[PDB]
Amino acid sequence: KQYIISEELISEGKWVKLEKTTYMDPTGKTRTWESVKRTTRKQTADGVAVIPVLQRTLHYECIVLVKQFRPPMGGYCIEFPAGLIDDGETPEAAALRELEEETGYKGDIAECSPAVCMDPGLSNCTIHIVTVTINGDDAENARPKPKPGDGEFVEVISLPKNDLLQRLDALVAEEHLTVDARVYSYALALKHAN
Amino acid sequence: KQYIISEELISEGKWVKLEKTTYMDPTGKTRTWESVKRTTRKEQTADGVAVIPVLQRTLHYECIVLVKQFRPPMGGYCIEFPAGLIDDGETPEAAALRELEEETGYKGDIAECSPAVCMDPGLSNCTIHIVTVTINGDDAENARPKPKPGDGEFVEVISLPKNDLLQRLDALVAEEHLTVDARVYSYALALKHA
Numbered sequence: 191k192q193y194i195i196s197e198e199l200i201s202e203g204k205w206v207k208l209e210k211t212t213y214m215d216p217t218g219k220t221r222t223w224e225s226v227k228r229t230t231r232k233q234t235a236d237g238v239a240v241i242p243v244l245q246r247t248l249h250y251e252c253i254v255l256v257k258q259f260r261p262p263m264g265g266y267c268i269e270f271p272a273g274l275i276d277d278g279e280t281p282e283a284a285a286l287r288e289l290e291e292e293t294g295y296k297g298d299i300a301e302c303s304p305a306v307c308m309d310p311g312l313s314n315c316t317i318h319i320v321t322v323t324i325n326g327d328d329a330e331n332a333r334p335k336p337k338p339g340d341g342e343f344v345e346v347i348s349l350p351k352n353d354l355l356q357r358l359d360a361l362v363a364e365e366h367l368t369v370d371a372r373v374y375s376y377a378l379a380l381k382h383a384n
Numbered sequence: 385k386q387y388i389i390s391e392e393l394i395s396e397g398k399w400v401k402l403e404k405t406t407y408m409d410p411t412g413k414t415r416t417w418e419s420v421k422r423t424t425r426k427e428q429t430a431d432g433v434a435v436i437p438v439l440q441r442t443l444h445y446e447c448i449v450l451v452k453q454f455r456p457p458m459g460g461y462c463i464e465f466p467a468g469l470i471d472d473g474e475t476p477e478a479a480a481l482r483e484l485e486e487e488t489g490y491k492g493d494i495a496e497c498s499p500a501v502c503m504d505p506g507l508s509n510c511t512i513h514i515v516t517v518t519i520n521g522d523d524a525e526n527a528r529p530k531p532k533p534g535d536g537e538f539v540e541v542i543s544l545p546k547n548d549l550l551q552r553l554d555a556l557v558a559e560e561h562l563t564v565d566a567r568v569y570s571y572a573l574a575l576k577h578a
């Protein structure tokens with residue numbers, strides 16, 4: 191019933207553009223929207239985010255997260271390891287590579303989502319959410335060696351999965367960070383389950 | 385270590401702006417970024433709210449109340465938590481309850497309210513509070529709930545069993561062209577992984 195009539199460029203950067211979208215509402219009245227797109231998609235999705243479950247025997251299972259300065263936020267954020275998918279890269283392979291780049295951990299694919307939207311009221315940005323286990327007793331994950339690309343500055347934070355939401359709250363209390371909304375949503379449902 | 389040096393407007397629309405961000409990297413070298421921001425944010429602790437509405441009904445499995453809408457940035461239909469921007473002066477909790485009623489018809493009760501969390505921190509400064517709300521499905525007010533959608537809002541309600549959330553989302557995605565939001569997917573994944 192609803193659909194795009196046309197898109198008008200308002201401004202294009204190197205990395206992102208701002209558009210004016212004309213669309214037909216379900217009454218048959220034409221209406222406008224301001225929409226953000228990345229310039230980089232060429233792919234299933236712009237990005238992957240990795241849910242990394244670090245499993246060591248005799249330890250709590252942890253979820254591995256990253257802390258980075260995010261310039262749009264003017265501050266530090268806690269997030270799932272993530273990055274954009276390279277043209278020709280599959281989302282699984284992007285996940286494995288981003289996890290290793292950002293955390294040094296070498297993981298196995300558990301499962302992969304379809305493309306899901308990041309902020310659909312503002313942007314067309316999508317990601318694949320890729321659940322990955324990390325055999326933390328394996329020698330290759332003993333001294334995880336992070337291989338950052340140029341400009342990445344990434345602290346690794348592993349938190350127990352059984353207390354994730356309280357631990358994220360506690361960090362926000364002392365550290366003055368912003369937790370990512372997908373991270374917080376996952377942490378909430380861990381508490382809300384059963 | 386890292387901090388914002390300057391924020392230069394590139395293009396300001398009615399609803400969204402693009403900025404050139406200049407910041408200090410942690411090697412002591414100046415760098416830049418393209419940042420998206422809303423023009424709507426005032427003294428709000430966040431741009432918006434998203435509601436996690438748990439419909440509770442005696443001798444029913446608990447359901448998660450979702451909405452399906454056309455999202456002009458995405459050029460298609462998206463399944464999301466009920467959500468909206470916080471009006472000036474409105475509390476996150478008030479905005480969550482109002483948006484939940486407007487979009488679904490249900491009158492909830494506040495359970496919990498997150499700190500401000502980032503929507504897509506590599507791209508924008510947008511934040512929300514994620515507010516968990518219970519709905520007493522056995523109350524007469526929530527019996528045959530009528531949405532009060534605002535001007536240009538067209539929202540369908542989709543209630544899905546919490547105990548089967550992720551498979552139910554996959555079955556909707558299998559049926560038609562429609563995207564599931566990353567926060568909803570993340571929440572449904574965690575329900576599985578617990």
Ligand SMILES: C[C@@H]1CN(C(=O)c2cnsn2)[C@@H](C)CO1
Nearest residue numbers: 222223224225311312399400469
């Ligand atoms: C159409 C207006 C603007 N708006 C947006 O969310 C928006 C539009 N383009 S970007 N963000 C809501 C406040 C609804 O009323």
Ligand SMILES: C[C@@H]1CN(C(=O)c2cnsn2)[C@@H](C)CO1
Nearest residue numbers: 205206274416417418419506507
């Ligand atoms: C500065 C570059 C571009 N980029 C972004 O994510 C980006 C930056 N501003 S908006 N999107 C990464 C691919 C690597 O760093």
Ligand SMILES: [Cl-]
Nearest residue numbers: 243300321577
């Ligand atoms: Cl798992």
Ligand SMILES: [Mg+2]
Nearest residue numbers: 271272273292
């Ligand atoms: Mg990343």
Ligand SMILES: [Mg+2]
Nearest residue numbers: 272273288291
């Ligand atoms: Mg990366």
Ligand SMILES: [Mg+2]
Nearest residue numbers: 466467468487
């Ligand atoms: Mg809404």
Ligand SMILES: [Mg+2]
Nearest residue numbers: 467468483486
């Ligand atoms: Mg609304």
